[PDB]
Design a protein around this ligand. Structure first.
Ligand code: AZA
Ligand code: AZA
Ligand code: AZA
Ligand code: AZA
Ligand code: NA
Ligand code: NA
Ligand code: NA
Ligand code: NA
Ligand code: XE
Ligand code: XE
Ligand code: XE
Ligand code: XE
Lengths: 295, 295, 295, 295
């Protein structure tokens, strides 16, 4: 037998950083969960019990904190690239670093119509994420994403004209509820290294904001023919607005809300045009994915 | 042996309701999870296998949907009181109904600065809850609450002057992070029945809004001497603003963020006044509770 | 306003302890999650910012570890009583301690038919729990429980003869699936203090074992007329076997498995006597409770 | 823009099946969660709102139940292959089916030393899983796995001789706790189609049993030099025992248990050779992966 692939590191490293403006007194907080996995010439740790090749996962944890102390942690695409580059430059035998960052929301509170200098609220479990793969001699590959964005529209969704055969019971509909949890990923063109990532720093926050705005507006305004058709419209617009993105991937559950027939009870009308009370279904759920790229 | 207490019913009943304004085209959605447990002369179902006394839990589920179809579901204090009253009036041998409702957030989306007529976002897992106990001959007892409100302040929290003995290692501090998940419950004076609950309908939403506003403002503005002292200030203000509340209960975790000493690494300074990077602790956590009532 | 009730302490304290037999080489591990909340003359910490009355929650955490180092951690009823007693004896102004312990399973592995001296498996998320309330001048109240015991029987459950009215759609049945997660609590007679708890130490493990055995056997063998009737049989037997128990409480979800009518597809028969494939329902669920005591 | 990749289907489909032996009266239950995603000539559903190419996800759900009614559901490798093949054969324009199955444990109860005919317990959240990819013209690729197998050993784990530099604080150790949640996957050689999968049916259950047995024995008996070295030993043995496996992948968290220095309290000795009470750490955790194949 032989080692075909190996990676190891530290997962679930929670990090908080505060920035204090001494002039204004305003404080800004960042909180992340970080994972770093390394690859390289480490096979002998597995095959021969040779620990000399192992950068301890505990040391990887220390490095994450030290790097956060000495560098900006925002945008996460930059922080991830700094962190990954560190490992491939410091250790001759490490040739790839894989950095995953989940950013948690701490939104500044408004008190009496004014932004508070040092108080924050977690407004939703929506996350902003990055996956950064730093590979020696091959540059830096960055996938940016938003996830956990949960939305619902109560009308202006349709689903008719699908294949009907002996396995089909679903009725066609011209008016239904559509609800989903949005997972959207945009993949950047390969960057040659840290200098190039630094040169594009302003684009990271702007593209995240654009992706979020396009997702929300398209969901709200599209008279949806299907989840498939609506998600494609979203992806098309993001690619049109940022030339440095190569692909956009959406993964969307279809979280079903079922009509409840109450006619058995005193002829009560609660279906079709009379539907007011519905039963949200926890499972099963549709799952629709697509990756959109350039012509 | 004898049955000392018994209750049974249906838990985890998910309900969605839509209201459609035909004039404006504006739609408003409500989504809840409901639990209903009944008590009464039902001992024989346990002791003698006498099912004749059992209103099937499946029927309780049907009743929740029918009641939602025929009545407003907001404020939840009203809906819960209607639902509980139904069971004690319909069934001679049922003498108490216990209704728990969790309300999920569906906040109307703003698209291009305008409120959208039929599109909604889940902005946080904060819940608004009610517990309604309807007891035949003893009226209606309502506890209203908010939960899952997660906040953090990065300064203006202190903790010094506590008891020090041979079990104590904690250092006194004049500047720390304070973060918590707020669970706040206000208990209404007993209501004589549904007519009285109806008479106070406007107070329910207003008191929830007040409780939330007082919680946020006090947290943000108090130069906190302890979680204990800050929570008491919150409770005092709520009781002052709504005479129909008898008690306010807060239950607050103290979610710790620890300093990280980096001095071992090239003399790096990251403690006390130089603290920038912290380690959020998943566990253990302080847990502080208090119930405040009137003199 | 006035403080009506207050308690505070440390939650989610994870503790592991190993016992090493030097003679045999056999090692035995225990792992728990502990919560300790205190009450007493502490109102001034809330009302006047007087921290002098506060035993820091951090110190409570230290105390849990020190107490585990110096005492047996099994049975948990004993450990909880030692821990609670410590606080009321050490601190003049603390008058009640509330200790909750969750015990996690680490079951010794069998390798090649022999018990391994130092290797363990988590066989299920079933827990053994204790709640110990130590109140100065009023002794020690102990509630012991098992929870997270998940079982299913595929036949020998019935449910017919229930109330039928205009809210009822449920069909009577003489053969159904019954599945539940068992939560069972036995409450001990009040103990005068630690000496009395020590005197009954062998009864704690034996009663837990009896409660588990009675639950499993009764579930498996009863031709169940309802969840209500089966749970009562369980409780009756436990009370008969341990005179020092005052009450037994069961709380049982009814986790539904629905028939799937496939007749629309080529006349396929999958209901009643022909039912083979079912759809487990995540929600809603029946919830049935009862507390059984002595005549 | 263009669709680069697309797949869609139904996730989280819970299925239960019972087998009844009429001769012996013995019943056997199976419970799974199933996901099926399809690929093929479906781009126009995304780009042109052409639903005619869509097999509704609701119909996919129906198909899972019908297929379970008409076929064995065990071993899951066979059921998954039947299910996937169905879609590529039935629908001309569907060219790949991806089937994921999670099998839940229902272990027959022993009552008074005898196996019960129709009563079952969930002994742990350990799962047996399959991923089956059925691709038209390219056969059937099956990855089998076990996950959620949680183990701990209290001694006979070491970790010394790792790289030490200015980022390192971890002390070398010759005796530590090792605990992990095992995720192990074995990938079968490509099968030409359903006939070939059928021909190997007995190997599926036997290989799962072997993988589990090798994992447990190696964990228990290895005087572990590192997680890396121990996991490699496991993988090597599985590959030696089943020639139809091409690769074995392990993914193992290192769930840390930290010593607690109690020396500050009355010189209490609880480190190194005197360590008895430890603090389990919820996060962060080491994460170690490896894929082992043939020379
Ligand atoms: O077994 C281990 N492997 C590792 O790579 C490691 N790093 N820190 N501790 C460790 N333990
Ligand atoms: O065992 C049961 N008890 C009940 O109260 C009930 N209600 N519906 N089905 C039921 N099954
Ligand atoms: O606000 C606090 N209250 C307490 O009781 C406590 N104990 N440790 N830290 C603390 N912080
Ligand atoms: O938008 C939808 N897309 C689908 O593929 C589907 N299948 N059933 N319902 C559906 N809704
Ligand atoms: Na390198
Ligand atoms: Na009544
Ligand atoms: Na005392
Ligand atoms: Na095909
Ligand atoms: Xe969508
Ligand atoms: Xe607080
Ligand atoms: Xe039961
Ligand atoms: Xe391991």
């Amino acid at each position: 037998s032989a080692v075909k692939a190996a990676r190891y590191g530290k997962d679930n490293v929670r990090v908080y950083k505060v920035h204090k403006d001494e002039k204004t007194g305003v404080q800004t907080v960042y909180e992340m969960t970080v994972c770093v996995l390394l690859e390289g010439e480490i096979e002998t740790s597995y095959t021969k019990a040779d620990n000399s090749v192992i950068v301890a996962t505990d040391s990887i944890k220390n490095t994450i904190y030290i790097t956060a102390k000495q560098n900006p942690v925002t945008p996460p695409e930059l922080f991830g690239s700094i962190l990954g580059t560190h490992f491939i430059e410091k250790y001759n035998h490490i040739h790839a670093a894989h950095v995953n960052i989940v950013c948690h929301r701490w939104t500044r509170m408004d008190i009496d119509g004014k932004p508070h200098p040092h108080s924050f609220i977690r407004d939703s479990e929506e996350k902003r994420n990055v996956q950064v793969d730093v590979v020696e001699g091959k540059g830096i590959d960055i996938k940016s994403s938003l996830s956990g964005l949960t939305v619902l529209k109560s009308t202006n969704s349709q689903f008719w004209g699908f294949l009907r055969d002996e396995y089909t019971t679903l009725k066609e509909t011209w008016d239904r509820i559509l609800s989903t949890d949005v997972d959207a990923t945009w993949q950047w063109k390969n960057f040659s290294g840290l200098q190039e990532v630094r040169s594009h720093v302003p684009k990271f926050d702007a593209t995240w904001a654009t992706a979020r705005e396009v997702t929300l507006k398209t969901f709200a305004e599209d008279n949806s023919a299907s989840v498939q058709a609506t998600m494609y419209k979203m992806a098309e617009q993001i690619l049109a607005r940022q030339q440095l993105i190569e692909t956009v991937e959406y993964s969307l559950p279809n979280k079903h809300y079922f009509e409840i027939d109450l006619s058995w009870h005193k002829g009560l009308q609660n279906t079709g045009k009379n539907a007011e009370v519905f039963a949200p279904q926890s499972d099963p759920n549709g799952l629709i994915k697509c990756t959109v790229g350039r012509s």
